[PDB]
Amino acid sequence: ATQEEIIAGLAEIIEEVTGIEPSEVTPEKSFVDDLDIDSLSMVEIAVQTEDKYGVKIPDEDLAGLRTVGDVVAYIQKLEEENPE
Amino acid sequence: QLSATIDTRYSTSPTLLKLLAMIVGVAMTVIALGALHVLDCADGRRHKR
Amino acid sequence: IPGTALGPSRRIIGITIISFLAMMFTPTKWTHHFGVFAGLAGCLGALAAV
Amino acid sequence: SREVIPRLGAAAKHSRAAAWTAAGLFLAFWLPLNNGLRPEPIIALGILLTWCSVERGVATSRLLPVAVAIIIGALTLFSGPTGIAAVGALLVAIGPLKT
Numbered sequence: 001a002t003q004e005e006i007i008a009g010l011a012e013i014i015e016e017v018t019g020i021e022p023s024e025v026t027p028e029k030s031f032v033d034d035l036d037i038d039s040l041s042m043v044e045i046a047v048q049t050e051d052k053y054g055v056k057i058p059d060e061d062l063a064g065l066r067t068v069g070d071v072v073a074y075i076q077k078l079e080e081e082n083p084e
Numbered sequence: 085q086l087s088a089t090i091d092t093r094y095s096t097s098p099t100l101l102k103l104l105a106m107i108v109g110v111a112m113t114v115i116a117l118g119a120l121h122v123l124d125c126a127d128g129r130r131h132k133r
Numbered sequence: 134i135p136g137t138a139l140g141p142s143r144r145i146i147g148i149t150i151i152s153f154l155a156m157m158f159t160p161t162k163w164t165h166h167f168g169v170f171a172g173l174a175g176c177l178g179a180l181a182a183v
Numbered sequence: 184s185r186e187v188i189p190r191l192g193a194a195a196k197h198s199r200a201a202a203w204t205a206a207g208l209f210l211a212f213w214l215p216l217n218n219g220l221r222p223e224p225i226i227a228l229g230i231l232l233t234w235c236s237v238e239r240g241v242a243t244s245r246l247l248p249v250a251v252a253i254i255i256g257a258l259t260l261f262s263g264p265t266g267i268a269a270v271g272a273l274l275v276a277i278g279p280l281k282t
């Protein structure tokens with residue numbers, strides 16, 4: 001529910017899939033610009049997050065989600081139908 | 085009269101039934117993997133390369 | 134290995150070990166049968182350089 | 184150089200010594216051992232394409248590249264009697280197929 005605890009999990013997923021150390025993932029940093037993450041790793045991060053969070057994002061953020069701050073803001077403003 | 089049957093056991097050729105079974109089996113394998121792709125594209129994501 | 138992905142590194146090392154173990158069931162023991170490792174050698178070169 | 188090394192991570196993708204020693208071990212295996220008509224280059228390229236198809240099936244979570252990897256592995260299993268080395272790439276691909 002907090003931004004500063006979903007960043008700590010998304011940095012773990014990015015570290016597992018790609019290999020960036022989790023001290024580099026800051027919410028002002030872009031994906032294909034500074035982290036330099038290719039598209040197969042984008043699909044792999046998407047299916048890992050679908051496995052762990054349970055939210056399904058097929059195509060609405062495949063071409064509209066740029067930075068990790070936008071990811072965590074999307075997670076914050078979508079969570080109103082909590083299954084917990 | 086000398087006679088000798090030569091061992092030509094590897095000089096075979098397919099019959100009609102074996103040839104039709106090979107053709108229909110390869111065609112059914114192709115159709116099965118095409119249906120497997122149509123099942124895999126259920127989640128909305130396209131090819132793009 | 135620190136700056137690398139987990140799964141692919143594990144699977145490269147596992148495939149190379151199982152290839153060495155599976156190569157003992159061949160009927161002839163020649164030296165030119167090591168040529169099957171020419172694709173895995175670049176992968177282990179990248180891992181052993183990192 | 185285009186499929187495996189950018190897949191193994193970021194420290195393997197942005198470093199140059201990894202590329203030069205990967206090229207070196209590739210040539211050191213290819214030149215004395217694969218300049219002929221034997222099934223050895225077929226089996227080497229088949230093991231790479233089997234691992235690449237399986238690795239693409241895990242990421243996108245799809246079964247068709249796993250089935251293509253089964254076809255390629257069974258195809259290079261019967262190139263020669265030394266093709267039994269492809270059972271490594273076949274047996275590592277059981278856990279991912281279960282997932």
Ligand SMILES: *P(=O)(O)OCC(C)(C)[C@H](O)C(=O)NCCC(=O)NCCS
Pocket residue numbers: 038039040043130131132133243
């Ligand atoms: P990235 O832009 O390099 O693309 C990698 C991925 C895997 C996301 C690519 O878009 C893709 O989905 N390829 C799948 C292709 C496919 O399934 N083809 C079927 C027969 S051509």
